[PDB]
Paper text:
We further investigated the non-naturally occurring mutant [name], located in the primary RNA-binding interface, and described it as an RNA-binding deficient mutation. Interestingly, though widely used as a biological tool to mute [name] RNA-binding in a fl-N context, no structural characterization of this des_mutant existed. We determined KD values for des_mutant [name] by MST and found that it binds Ext RNA around 25-fold weaker compared to WT. Yet interestingly, it still binds Ext about two- to three-fold stronger than the R107A mutant. Considering a structure-based explanation, we solved the 1.93 Å crystal structure of [name] and found that this des_mutation, similarly to the nat-mutants tested above, has no mentionable effect on the global [name] fold (RMSD 0.674 Å). Furthermore, NMR-derived backbone dynamics for the [name] mutant compare well with those of WT suggesting the domain’s fold and intrinsic plasticity are unaltered. Altogether and in line with previous studies, this study shows by high-resolution information that the tyrosine-to-alanine mutation directly interferes with RNA-binding, but not with the [name] fold integrity. Notably, while significantly reduced in affinity, the mutant still bound RNA via the primary RNA-binding interface. Yet, mutation of close-by residue R107 had a much stronger effect on RNA-binding, underlining that [name] should be considered as RNA-binding impaired rather than RNA-binding incapable in future studies. A prominent example is the proclaimed loss of RNA-binding capability in [name] that had been misinterpreted before, while we here–together with a recent study by Estelle et al.21–revise the effect of this mutant, facilitated by an atom-resolved view.
One central protein involved in the formation of regulatory ribonucleoprotein complexes (RNP) is the coronaviral structural protein nucleocapsid (N). N plays a major role in RNA genome replication, translation, and packaging and has further been found to interfere with host-integrated stress responses and stress granule formation. The N-[name] possesses a peculiar, hand-like three-dimensional fold, with a β-sheet palm and several flexible loops, arranged as fingers around the central β-sheet. The latter, together with the extraordinarily long basic β-hairpin finger, constitutes the positively charged primary RNA-binding surface.
Numbering used by the authors: 48 to 174
Amino acid sequence: NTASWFTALTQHGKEDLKFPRGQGVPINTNSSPDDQIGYYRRATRRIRGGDGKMKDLSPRWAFYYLGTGPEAGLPYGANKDGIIWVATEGALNTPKDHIGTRNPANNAAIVLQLPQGTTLPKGFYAE
């Protein structure tokens, strides 16, 4: 049982996450140009709201390197609801088992940061 290497993006708006081609891979100085590829997975948590009724919190979208997390078996570009793909120019379309997922017992999450020119899509924030 593991976690994303990075903190999540919170969807405060109403649009599903998407990044233009070449953008969206979180910065990780412990990874190489070939490794810069993966997917974000949506996770919507439910909570007992103020009025006693169950309700959805804002969705979170967590990054996983290609071939590693809850959808480790998916090839790049696979169509699946709640899954969107990202790849930096020059990345290799190969699984990243050498990066894998994070064990929270011995590694903090990396704060999700994107290169300077990239801005997060509308309604998206790295909290």
